[PDB]
Amino acid sequence: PWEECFQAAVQLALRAGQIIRKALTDLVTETDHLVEDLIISELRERFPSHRFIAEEAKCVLTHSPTWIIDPIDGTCNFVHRFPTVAVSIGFAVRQELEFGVIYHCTEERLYTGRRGRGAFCNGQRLRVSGETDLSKALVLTEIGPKRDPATLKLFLSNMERLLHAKAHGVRVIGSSTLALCHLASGAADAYYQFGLHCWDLAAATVIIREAGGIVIDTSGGPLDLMACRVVAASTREMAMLIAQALQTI
Amino acid sequence: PWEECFQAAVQLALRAGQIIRKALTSAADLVTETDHLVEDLIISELRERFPSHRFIAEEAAASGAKCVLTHSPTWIIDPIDGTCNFVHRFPTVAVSIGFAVRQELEFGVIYHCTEERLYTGRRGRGAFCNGQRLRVSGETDLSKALVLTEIGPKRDPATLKLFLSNMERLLHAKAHGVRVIGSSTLALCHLASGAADAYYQFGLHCWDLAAATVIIREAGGIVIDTSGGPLDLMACRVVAASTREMAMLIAQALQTIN
């Protein structure tokens, strides 16, 4: 539940970070297998008692020390060579998130956060924007990798309401973890999405909160990992305003 | 005309890239300052070195309506593309300098400020990025298509419901993905590099697509009008794919303002 395993996450984040980096050079998904295997394998060895949740009834979090990982977030980008793919390694214990280590492979940024001990990216300490005016917010969001008839109106409509509140703008970059990190750094003021598995927000959650940001459920309430839905923002006013326009549908 | 001018294009994209990159370290106060500095820094030097050249920029168009490309040597400029990103320190802003002659796009030069990516294109001389020669993906199935689009700066049921409908139409086809990064120039350089397959937008100033057009073309891709016909700088709209099929498949999806 601390340091010894946190430094384990950083290097592993780095090793995998190095593995897909020179590999990013339609199923190169073997890279997914090489980086996960390599990470879950070295962590299972060094910490046998620990549990593991990751893109293997899914995000059932116990109270025992567990690891939530995403071998390579931004796989659709990776395919097309579109520079935005990360590695997420989140760590829980007592059924709460302890720390997070996201890694931007291309641009080489090591976003990391730890419960109580602040958030950081390659040295510089992170701190969210603090925006509260929806009309000044840069909102990031993703689209379910799953494409079926009506799971659409939740994208086009959500985007619709949010878009009229006078959002200064809207992004979609093909990577929830990285989008979440833009939130922690301050480059964005909010994020929302339906359909992101927990291994995408476990790491990013400790990071954002350790930078002053908040992470709740799409419905104004608290974050629920088993939900596959989240709404994080710079401030509470912002966050609530987001869950507002947001349609639980 | 072409050598002295192109190298001038580079020097300035760069210098400006430089003065902007530093700036990314308050309100929308400073962006406007930088936009004016960069703009005045770029324009005043070219007008001095080439006192006969014409300009298609944001700060000329004061003439009401604009983007009228004559036959004389003209510079299409965008001192800062991605100013909203600039405001929020979202790492995606560019400087763009296009050059036309005989009413044709001669060379493009777009600089990715933060990522230090310097894109250039020259009629018949190939497209590049930091030395690396560029080439489009050549993907042809809208189902494996990574598509890019941007929403204009304006917000009104008009230009809004349109964006959504087009988005809907594009998602209606099995488009493998959609990206919106807050930069049409950079969105376009990705199409030219192979990192994306298509792009489309209604309401984009012509200075945001002059340089970018030479580049996508010189890389192997095609840039056409939203209706599927020939590109029209006066239309403020576009479709750009890696293949003519991809291109028509996009225009096929969307239609126009009404």
Swiss-Prot record, chain A:
pH profile: Optimum pH is 7.5-8.0.
Induction, as annotated: Repressed by Li(+).
Gene3D superfamilies in the record: 3.40.190.80, Fructose-1,6-Bisphosphatase, subunit A, domain 1 (3.30.540.10)
EC annotation from Swiss-Prot or TrEMBL: 3.1.3.25
Pfam families membership: Inositol_P (PF00459)
Required cofactor(s): Mg(2+)
Places the protein is found: Cytoplasm
Keywords assigned: Cytoplasm, Hydrolase, Magnesium, Metal-binding
PANTHER family per the UniProt record, alphabetical: INOSITOL MONOPHOSPHATASE, INOSITOL MONOPHOSPHATASE 2
Protein name listed in UniProt: Inositol monophosphatase 2
Species for this entry: Homo sapiens
UniProtKB/Swiss-Prot annotation, chain B:
Listed cofactors: Mg(2+)
Single GO molecular function: inositol monophosphate 3-phosphatase activity
Mutation effect (D81N): Loss of activity
UniProt activity-regulation remark: Inhibited by high Li(+) and restricted Mg(2+) concentrations.
Disulfide bond sites: none
Binding site for substrate: E58, I80, D81, G82, T83, G182, S183, S184, Q201, D208
Keyword rRNA-binding assigned: no
Keywords: Cytoplasm, Hydrolase, Magnesium, Metal-binding
Induction, per UniProt: Repressed by Li(+).
Subcellular location field: Cytoplasm
Function comment: Phosphatase that can use myo-inositol monophosphates, myo-inositol 1,4-diphosphate, scyllo-inositol-1,4-diphosphate, glucose-1-phosphate, beta-glycerophosphate and 2'-AMP as substrates in vitro. It is likely that IMPA2 has an as yet unidentified in vivo substrate(s). Has been implicated as the pharmacological target for lithium (Li(+)) action in brain.
Assembly, per entry: Homodimer.
Name of protein: Inositol monophosphatase 2
Gene that specifies this protein: IMPA2
